[PDB]
């Protein structure tokens, strides 16, 4: 389960490279599975 930013989602995929993919979580090339993302705007976002 991740909190990842919106633009970043492209990164959670087998091949990608970027801050999230490099520094935080990396999939193997061989990854077998799905990535289900949905913006949870209401749950975690505040005026501050």
């Amino acid at each position: 389960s991740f909190v990842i930013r919106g633009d970043e989602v492209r990164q959670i995929a087998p091949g990608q490279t970027g801050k999230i993919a490099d520094y935080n979580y990396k999939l193997p090339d061989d990854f077998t599975g799905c990535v289900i993302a949905w913006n949870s705007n209401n749950l975690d976002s505040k005026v501050g």
């Binding site: 087998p14 091949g15 990608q16 490279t17 090339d29």
Partner: protein, 48 residues
Amino acid sequence: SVLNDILSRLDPPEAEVQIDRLITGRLQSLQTYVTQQLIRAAEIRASA
């Protein structure tokens, strides 16, 4: 044409695809060489 440059310049996710092309070619070439090699050897054997 150089293996190192692909590794150097390209990320592995991209590199893997590129090297793969290079691999099939040489492997094909060696395959052509051995096949070519076998026939000539046979020619030699009959002569021998």
